[PDB]
């Protein structure tokens, strides 16, 4: 017979069968995955910081004396060999939480009699320990994942350029007005326009020794090319320097124009080729709880964008986005769940939204669509999302951000250097470009899987699915009619989950709510019922103490986290025996806080384990209070508790305080608030007639996109010749007379050889 143990024997991962460039290259070629002609880049060499950044010399109080820049002669080919953990030879990297499991089993045995509701917790945790494993996966899994990305983009349902499907930059931007309302960059709104290099984004206000405008980047993530094996914090100076140089070289090429008889293309192609590496990401293997059976066939990838490319794109993206908290909870008609938080009465409000008689109705967050239809809740995901994204998808997103975010009442708050970068360079850098895995520079299909960088592109993709959903009279998500939306758009999607009779099930939560922390203020004997909405990973349960619905983390997610904790990740001179225990207090208490409090055995076992570490440290004299000062950064669930300034306690009071309703933040939209909902906008757009609500800046961006790269400064001017003649009254009749004006100056680029394509081909020469 079979063995089956109470505690599974230490798992030994299989040998990675693609641990060689030779082997990997074979696999990619065998699947028709494209391997690029290897590009090389100059060796990094020292240079005085005073010389490269003279304007940032005043860092003489409280920089790094020299900088390492890709300037020295002798080219090298870049190499990225990430470590996979666990592995066959080093298997003990991330052990399952056996101490937790033993404690749960222990407490179950202490219970006088029976109870299978309790035992289900021990079963579920055990099943996770057996089936899954936390780690970096394998090269074989990464490569294998990539072939799936190519299949999404070029196989079953090949990607479609939205502009060749009737959509325009403006009509898309009018849809994003509803599904992603955006304001101006800013409290008080004192922000600078997109007209300067990153160096001058720090201002020496008041002479004789600083206002900070640069987007925030986390100092611990990898720098990327040209600094493999270095972090963003270690390359801050370098990141600015390269961005400066690139943007300065760009503004020269536009200042110089296209020259006589196009004798300046060489200068453009020269530059783009020299900065090829700005379009090459590192295939970082993402660490998560993969299941053992697919350890060799699925490993999620993070496309580590080079820091200059990130900095420049986030200079366009972040000042707008970190200042637009506009969602379903503060704008009527709005389906966006952007910056939604389930605490502070947040979840109750979504549940009340569901209970409302209205249907069909949709909610969006990036690559997530939630739909209630015929009293059924549908949770929908785009297949790989990023993989479906084309360059025109992103340049449409860029058009939207610059139009509604970086424009004062029609007027552009951006120069032509930033306009040309956003419309014609940035999408080519990040979508359908390349990545460096081992020593191999290989193509990426669609956008690379970031998670912050990919938000707006994915949200756009879903917005199109939503528009298309409206156009065919809002069919039931499971129907054939709904499924035909992916054949029409080239975007892959699938129903992740559906709950029949959603309103009845939600209502029943009020009746069947058990005693607990939020109902009677006691330690729960039994789990209180939930509806597993998976609303951004959150479920709904009812609180009798507060009289409202309160969030509990999705049950599978909760027990998936409980089974395999994330690693510490680097521990230098900072203590020794204290840190290991201290992290466990964080681990166990944070588990309770997100939803462990609802699950009697998990709640009690976590409480005991945390209390055990807490008492040990308290007798040892560890500064635990000072440690937990920003526990938010130390926990994998910390994001949801950011700026909340609340202690790790998980009591009746703390849980009630965490959920006590607070009025939603006032919306910040740069234009008069639209409250018509998406359904109406979809029909107004299908007619073909719609107003150019972008203003002048929209005509500037249409000219920049629709003409040649080097003739960008002429493009703005020709669009201003149009703006001075007052018609606006229809976008299409306006858009076509602009295309003629571009043909009158011979600046309009040839079909299939657009400004965006030319820079794509230039990036690998
Ligand atoms: Mg979803
Ligand atoms: Mg997706
Ligand atoms: Mg996303």
């Amino acid at each position: 017979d079979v063995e089956e143990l109470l505690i599974p024997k230490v798992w030994v991962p299989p040998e990675d069968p693609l641990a060689s460039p030779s082997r990997l290259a074979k696999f990619l070629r065998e699947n028709g995955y494209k391997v690029l002609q290897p590009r090389s880049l100059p060796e990094n060499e020292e240079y005085e910081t005073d010389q490269i950044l003279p304007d940032l010399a005043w860092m003489r109080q409280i920089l790094k004396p020299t900088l390492s820049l890709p300037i020295g002669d002798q080219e090298y080919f870049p190499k990225y060999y990430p470590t996979h953990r666990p592995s066959k030879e080093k298997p003990n990297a991330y052990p399952p939480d056996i101490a937790l499991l033993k404690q749960m089993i222990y407490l179950f045995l202490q219970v006088p009699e029976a109870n299978e509701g309790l035992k289900d917790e021990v079963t579920l945790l055990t099943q996770n320990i057996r089936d899954k494993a936390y780690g970096s996966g394998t090269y074989m899994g990464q490569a294998n994942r990539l072939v799936a990305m190519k299949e999404v983009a070029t196989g079953r349902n090949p990607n479609k350029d939205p502009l060749k499907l009737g959509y325009t930059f403006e009509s898309i931007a009018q849809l994003l007005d509803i599904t992603l309302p955006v304001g101006p960059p800013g409290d008080d709104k004192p922000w600078v326009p997109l007209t300067r290099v990153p160096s001058r984004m720090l201002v020496l206000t008041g002479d004789v020794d600083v206002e900070d405008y640069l987007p925030k980047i986390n100092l611990k993530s990898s720098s990327g090319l040209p600094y493999v094996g270095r972090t963003k914090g270690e390359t801050i100076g370098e990141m600015i320097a390269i961005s400066n140089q690139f943007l300065r070289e760009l503004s020269t090429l536009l200042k110089q124009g296209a020259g006589t008889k196009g004798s300046n293309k060489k200068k453009l192609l020269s530059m783009l080729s020299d900065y090829w590496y700005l379009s090459c990401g590192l295939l970082f293997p993402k660490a998560e709880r993969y299941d053992k059976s697919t350890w060799l066939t699925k490993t999620r990838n993070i496309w580590s964008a080079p820091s200059p490319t990130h900095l420049m794109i986030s200079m366009i993206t972040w000042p707008v986005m970190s200042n637009s908290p506009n969602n379903v909870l503060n704008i009527e008609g709005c389906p966006s769940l952007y910056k939604f938080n389930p605490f502070r009465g947040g979840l109750n409000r979504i549940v009340e939204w569901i209970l409302a008689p209205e249907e069909p109705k949709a909610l969006v967050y990036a690559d997530n669509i939630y739909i209630v239809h015929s009293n059924t809740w549908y949770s929908i995901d785009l297949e790989k999302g990023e993989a479906n994204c084309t360059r025109q998808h992103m340049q449409a997103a860029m058009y939207y951000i610059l139009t509604r975010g970086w424009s004062d009442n029609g007027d552009p708050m951006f120069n032509q250097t930033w306009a040309t970068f956003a419309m014609n360079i940035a999408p080519a850098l990040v979508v359908d470009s390349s990545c460096l895995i081992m020593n191999l520079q290989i193509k990426t299909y669609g956008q690379g899987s970031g998670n912050a960088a990919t938000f707006i592109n994915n949200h756009l993709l879903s917005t199109l699915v939503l528009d298309q959903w409206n156009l065919m009279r809002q069919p039931r998500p499971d129907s054939e009619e709904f499924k035909s939306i992916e054949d029409k758009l080239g975007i892959n999607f699938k129903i992740e989950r559906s709950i029949d009779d959603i309103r009845g099930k939600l209502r029943q939560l009020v009746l069947l709510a058990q005693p607990g922390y939020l109902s009677g203020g006691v330690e729960p004997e039994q789990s209180s019922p939930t509806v597993e909405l998976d609303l951004l990973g959150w479920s709904a349960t009812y609180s009798k103490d507060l009289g409202i619905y309160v969030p509990v983390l999705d049950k599978e997610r909760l027990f998936c986290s409980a089974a395999y904790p994330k690693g510490v990740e680097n521990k230098s001179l900072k203590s020794k025996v204290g840190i290991e225990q201290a992290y466990k207090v964080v681990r166990y208490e944070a588990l309770r806080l997100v939803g462990g409090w609802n699950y009697p055995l998990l709640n009690k076992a976590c409480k005991n384990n945390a209390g055990a570490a807490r008492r040990h440290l308290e007798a040892k004299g560890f500064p635990l209070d000072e440690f937990l000062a920003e526990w938010s950064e130390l926990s994998e669930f910390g994001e949801a508790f950011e700026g909340f300034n609340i202690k790790l306690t998980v009591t009746s009071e703390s849980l009630a305080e965490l959920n006590k309703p607070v009025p939603p933040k006032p919306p910040n939209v740069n234009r008069p608030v639209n409250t018509g909902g998406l359904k109406a906008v979809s029909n107004a757009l299908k007619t073909g007639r719609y107003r150019n609500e972008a203003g002048l800046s929209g005509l500037v961006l249409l000219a920049t996109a629709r003409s040649r790269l080097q003739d960008a400064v002429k493009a703005k001017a020709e669009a201003e010749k149009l703006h001075k003649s007052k018609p606006d009254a229809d976008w299409f009749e306006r858009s076509e007379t602009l295309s003629d004006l571009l043909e009158k100056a011979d600046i309009a680029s040839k079909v299939a050889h657009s400004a965006l394509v030319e820079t794509s081909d230039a990036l690998e020469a």
Side-chain angles (χ1 to χ4, degrees), residues 3-47 49-59 62 65-186 190-204 206-208 212-331 333-567 571 575 578-579 581-617 619-625 627-644 646-725 727 729-732 734-742 744-745 747-749 751-765:
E3 90 292 305
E4 42 221 309
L5 293 157
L6 174 75
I7 312 297
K9 199 178 193 286
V10 191
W11 185 57
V12 178
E15 283 218 41
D16 188 347
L18 282 181
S20 263
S22 37
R23 287 181 171 200
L24 176 52
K26 179 171 175 175
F27 180 75
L28 298 170
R29 272 176 249 267
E30 225 163 40
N31 297 296
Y33 201 93
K34 216 202 179 187
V35 179
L36 266 61
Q37 286 254 284
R39 281 99 89 229
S40 61
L41 78 185
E43 267 174 348
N44 298 347
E45 206 186 328
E46 298 308 297
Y47 214 121
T49 317
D50 274 20
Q51 207 69 15
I52 316 294
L53 307 170
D55 61 320
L56 289 168
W58 48 263
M59 306 292 204
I62 290 88
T66 53
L67 297 177
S68 191
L69 300 153
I71 50 158
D73 211 349
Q74 286 167 210
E75 313 276 309
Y76 71 96
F77 298 93
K79 288 166 278 163
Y80 178 60
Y81 289 91
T83 308
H84 296 87
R85 288 182 201 90
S87 60
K88 198 214 190 183
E89 287 205 289
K90 304 189 86 184
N92 296 343
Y94 307 103
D97 206 338
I98 296 315
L100 182 57
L101 182 62
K102 289 176 175 174
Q103 184 67 30
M104 291 187 67
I105 299 163
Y106 170 90
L107 295 158
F108 174 82
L109 293 178
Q110 294 306 309
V111 165
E113 250 151 36
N115 210 143
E116 293 298 292
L118 286 184
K119 203 207 282 168
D120 270 334
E121 290 184 53
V122 164
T123 312
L124 192 53
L125 189 65
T126 308
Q127 202 54 251
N128 284 330
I129 292 159
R130 284 187 219 277
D131 290 339
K132 299 190 168 192
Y134 179 84
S136 313
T138 52
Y139 281 109
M140 174 73 156
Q142 294 195 79
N144 215 291
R145 165 77 156 183
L146 290 181
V147 181
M149 311 277 262
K150 188 186 98 295
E151 211 70 35
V152 166
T154 52
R156 174 182 79 84
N157 187 40
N159 291 353
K160 295 194 185 191
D161 179 349
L163 308 171
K164 291 180 80 185
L165 293 158
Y167 289 94
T168 69
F169 294 129
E170 180 57 26
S171 76
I172 293 168
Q174 282 191 214
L175 291 163
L176 285 157
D177 286 337
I178 303 295
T179 71
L180 200 67
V182 289
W191 209 271
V192 290
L194 274 175
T195 45
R196 62 175 77 182
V197 292
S199 193
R200 289 191 292 267
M201 292 282 194
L202 301 319
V203 185
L204 41 87
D207 292 342
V208 181
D212 205 299
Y213 297 98
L214 288 165
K216 206 68 222 307
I217 47 97
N218 109 264
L219 312 180
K220 320 203 172 181
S221 66
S222 59
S223 177
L225 294 180
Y227 309 102
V228 185
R230 293 169 87 152
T231 48
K232 302 207 176 195
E234 291 166 346
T235 57
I236 277 165
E238 285 81 6
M239 166 191 62
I240 290 161
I242 301 167
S243 307
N244 276 6
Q245 267 307 306
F246 177 84
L247 285 165
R248 275 162 175 159
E249 282 180 49
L250 179 55
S251 39
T252 290
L253 290 175
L254 303 174
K255 181 193 186 285
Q256 290 195 293
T260 58
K261 208 193 268 77
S263 64
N264 271 152
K265 268 88 189 305
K266 287 93 76 183
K267 279 267 269 285
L268 186 101
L269 306 177
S270 177
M271 190 217 70
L272 285 163
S273 289
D274 283 345
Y275 288 105
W276 70 270
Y277 60 87
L278 295 182
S279 72
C280 187
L282 310 178
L283 254 205
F284 180 85
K286 189 170 190 273
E288 56 184 55
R289 290 98 183 182
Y290 301 103
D291 53 44
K292 286 161 182 171
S293 81
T294 74
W295 191 257
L296 292 187
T297 50
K298 188 191 77 180
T299 308
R300 281 172 179 78
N301 293 146
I302 296 179
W303 196 86
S304 295
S307 44
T309 303
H310 183 103
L311 167 69
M312 290 185 291
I313 294 172
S314 59
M315 263 193 282
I316 313 158
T317 234
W318 186 81
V320 172
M321 283 297 170
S322 71
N323 208 233
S324 300
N326 313 303
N327 54 36
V328 67
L329 298 187
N330 69 352
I331 295 167
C334 178
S336 183
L337 281 163
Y338 184 61
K339 280 183 176 176
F340 162 80
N341 188 94
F343 307 114
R344 304 269 180 270
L347 182 94
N348 180 75
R349 275 185 262 260
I350 266 79
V351 181
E352 284 194 350
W353 176 90
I354 299 162
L355 294 171
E358 282 73 18
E359 54 174 24
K361 51 191 184 202
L363 255 26
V364 258
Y365 188 93
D367 56 305
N368 302 253
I369 298 161
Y370 305 94
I371 285 170
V372 340
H373 189 291
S374 313
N375 197 30
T376 316
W377 168 266
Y378 295 90
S379 177
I380 304 154
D381 291 313
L382 312 178
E383 262 216 78
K384 263 75 170 169
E386 303 86 70
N388 290 298
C389 185
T390 76
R391 307 195 212 91
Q392 290 82 26
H393 283 288
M394 191 190 174
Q395 77 168 152
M398 283 313 205
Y399 170 88
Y400 178 77
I401 297 306
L402 283 169
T403 296
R404 330 271 148 154
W406 290 103
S407 277
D408 188 37
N409 207 249
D411 290 314
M413 263 164 49
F414 56 92
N415 69 20
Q416 220 45 217
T417 308
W418 280 100
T420 215
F421 172 75
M423 293 301 293
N424 290 317
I425 295 165
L429 294 169
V430 144
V431 182
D432 268 294
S433 64
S434 74
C435 67
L436 164 73
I437 180 51
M438 298 177 97
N439 57 357
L440 305 175
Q441 292 164 215
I442 62 172
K443 192 200 164 58
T444 74
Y445 292 85
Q447 182 182 197
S449 294
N451 214 52
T454 63
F455 179 85
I456 303 164
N457 293 343
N458 284 324
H459 204 283
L460 193 153
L461 268 44
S462 303
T463 298
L464 300 183
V465 176
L466 257 41
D467 177 56
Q468 215 64 224
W469 181 54
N470 300 346
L471 295 182
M472 56 200 313
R473 312 167 100 92
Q474 303 176 333
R476 200 201 201 107
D478 65 31
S479 81
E480 193 191 311
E481 291 81 6
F482 192 100
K483 194 65 183 181
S484 68
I485 291 166
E486 70 180 30
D487 302 285
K488 285 167 74 71
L489 288 170
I491 300 164
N492 300 26
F493 57 75
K494 47 132 190 144
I495 304 157
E496 189 272 321
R497 183 183 316 198
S498 64
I499 309 161
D500 286 310
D501 188 2
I502 181 67
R503 288 183 186 92
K505 274 153 186 173
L506 288 162
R507 286 188 198 102
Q508 165 148 295
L509 295 167
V510 183
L511 190 60
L512 303 190
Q514 296 299 119
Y517 288 112
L518 290 162
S519 291
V522 284
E523 185 177 288
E525 259 87 71
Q526 179 186 327
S527 162
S528 178
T530 67
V531 173
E532 301 283 289
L533 292 168
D534 193 49
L535 178 91
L536 299 180
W538 298 107
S539 293
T541 194
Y542 180 81
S543 169
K544 294 183 176 182
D545 290 341
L546 289 161
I548 61 148
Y549 294 98
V550 289
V552 179
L553 181 69
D554 186 59
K555 197 193 183 181
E556 277 167 23
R557 274 169 166 84
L558 188 57
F559 279 75
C560 192
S561 274
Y564 287 104
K566 291 182 170 174
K571 203 277 271 75
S575 191
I579 292 293
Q581 302 281 145
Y583 265 102
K584 285 179 184 167
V585 180
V586 180
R587 166 158 92 238
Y588 289 114
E589 294 281 64
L591 260 180
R592 297 220 287 151
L593 198 58
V594 288
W597 56 265
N598 189 52
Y599 298 96
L601 273 196
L602 179 59
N603 170 68
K604 185 64 181 191
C606 283
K607 196 200 177 183
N608 288 335
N609 288 12
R614 182 174 274 114
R615 287 187 307 278
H616 178 246
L617 294 164
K620 205 157 75 190
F622 192 86
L624 186 62
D625 316 307
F627 185 88
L628 303 174
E630 297 103 51
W631 63 264
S632 182
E633 334 289 56
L634 308 163
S635 180
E636 58 155 305
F637 300 115
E639 181 183 2
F641 307 95
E642 223 146 79
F644 277 41
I646 46 153
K647 295 154 193 170
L648 260 183
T649 329
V650 191
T651 58
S652 181
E653 292 72 32
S654 74
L655 270 164
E657 167 80 4
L658 174 67
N659 281 293
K660 190 197 184 184
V662 172
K665 300 305 157 199
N668 188 40
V669 192
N670 207 4
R671 45 188 59 215
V673 171
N674 198 326
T675 54
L678 186 67
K679 197 199 293 178
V681 180
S682 290
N683 299 318
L685 266 46
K686 73 159 189 168
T687 59
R689 202 283 177 203
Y690 52 90
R691 179 160 276 259
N692 175 34
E693 282 163 357
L696 162 67
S697 59
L699 304 163
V700 177
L701 294 176
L702 279 171
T704 303
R706 221 132 55 190
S707 63
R708 212 164 306 123
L709 215 160
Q710 305 203 272
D711 294 289
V713 82
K714 273 195 187 176
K716 184 183 193 166
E718 210 81 50
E720 294 205 68
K721 258 96 171 185
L722 216 193
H723 196 257
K724 271 200 173 62
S725 52
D730 192 277
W731 179 91
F732 190 83
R734 192 144 206 80
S735 172
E736 289 211 316
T737 48
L738 195 148
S739 285
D740 292 25
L741 282 164
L742 304 178
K744 271 204 192 75
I747 56 172
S749 65
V751 275
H753 308 141
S754 64
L756 227 194
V757 176
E758 294 298 325
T759 156
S760 271
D761 289 295
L763 280 167
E764 12 81 295

